[PDB]
């Protein structure tokens, strides 16, 4: 499957997009670019609380994401900054200056 809230942007000043990679912590998440294809990929591991409790309404079937998406330009690995948030993936490949 794939997702309503992954938008692809680009205002004048910066090539971006949002993700909904909600809660997964750095080492839930991986972000790689092989031949400025920019892949997304993921999972969210068990919550293992309390191995006891309920999940009355448990609709929460997250898993894995093997998304990419092309680009208009060639990347560059380092010049792009990586940060994850409140709930959301937002990497900036912002891009060169062009009239």
């Given amino acids: 499957s794939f997702l309503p ?3 692809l942007e680009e205002t004048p000043e910066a090539l971006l997009l949002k993700v909904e990679l909600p809660g997964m912590d750095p080492k839930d998440i991986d972000v790689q670019v092989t031949a400025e294809a920019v ?3 993921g999972e969210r591991k ?7 409790e309920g999940m009355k309404r448990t609709e929460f079937r997250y ?4 998304r990419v998406i092309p680009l208009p ?3 560059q690995n ?3 900054k990586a940060e994850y948030k409140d ?3 937002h990497l900036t490949l ?6």
Avoid: C, D, N, Y
Avoid at 46 to 51: L, P
Avoid at 63 to 66: A, H, S
């Fill in 73 to 75: 330009v060639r990347i």
């Fill in 87 to 89: 709930g959301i993936l």
């Fill in 5 to 7: 809230a992954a938008e």
């Fill in 94 to 99: 912002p891009k060169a200056e062009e009239e």
């Fill in 63 to 66: 898993g894995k994401f093997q």
């Fill in 78 to 80: 380092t010049s792009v």
């Fill in 39 to 41: 892949s997304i990929s």
């Fill in 46 to 52: 068990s919550e293992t609380k309390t191995e006891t």
